[PDB]
Amino acid sequence: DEEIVKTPRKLVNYVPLKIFNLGDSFDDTITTTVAKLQDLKKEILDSPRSN
Amino acid sequence: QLKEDINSRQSKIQKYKDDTIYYEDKKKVYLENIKKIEVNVAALKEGI
């Protein structure tokens, strides 16, 4: 193990952090714009096309 | 004997005052720890 004993630690030493928990990779904002465009194009499909 | 006993009791009073001083110092350290925990909780809540 490390050194001879357990490493010293602060009496609180919380440090929550954990902003991201796995996942990451694909961004959410780009696909959010994608989903907005999806509902927009569905609304367009509701509007008449051709004829 | 009463004079000796009351002098001993007065020294006991002063050592109680010293003990209360150390207890207040421990309480101040605990309050500093509480403030650090509070700012950490505030940062975590901000992320939340």
Side-chain angles (χ1 to χ4, degrees):
Chain A
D1 299 330
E2 61 277 352
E3 46 180 0
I4 191 66
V5 296
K6 301 179 180 180
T7 182
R9 194 187 64 91
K10 276 77 181 180
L11 81 167
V12 176
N13 195 359
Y14 280 172
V15 190
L17 297 181
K18 60 163 186 297
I19 295 95
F20 60 97
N21 294 125
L22 286 83
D24 306 328
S25 179
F26 201 78
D27 192 0
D28 215 335
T29 61
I30 53 169
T31 180
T32 309
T33 52
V34 164
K36 179 59 184 61
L37 264 57
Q38 188 274 331
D39 60 64
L40 188 151
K41 68 180 177 66
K42 181 58 182 60
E43 293 179 0
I44 286 180
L45 284 166
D46 309 329
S47 49
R49 189 53 147 78
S50 294
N51 63 59
Chain B
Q1 68 184 1
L2 180 59
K3 180 263 290 180
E4 178 63 32
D5 178 70
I6 65 180
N7 293 338
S8 63
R9 189 164 61 88
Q10 290 178 0
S11 300
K12 176 181 60 180
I13 295 170
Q14 81 185 359
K15 73 175 295 302
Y16 291 168
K17 289 197 292 291
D18 303 330
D19 297 330
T20 53
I21 288 178
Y22 321 132
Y23 296 155
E24 288 176 0
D25 301 330
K26 299 178 183 61
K27 182 178 59 181
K28 292 302 178 300
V29 174
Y30 298 155
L31 288 180
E32 176 67 26
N33 307 134
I34 287 184
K35 287 187 291 293
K36 289 192 295 296
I37 295 180
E38 283 177 358
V39 69
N40 296 329
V41 164
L44 181 57
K45 194 184 307 177
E46 184 269 352
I48 283 181

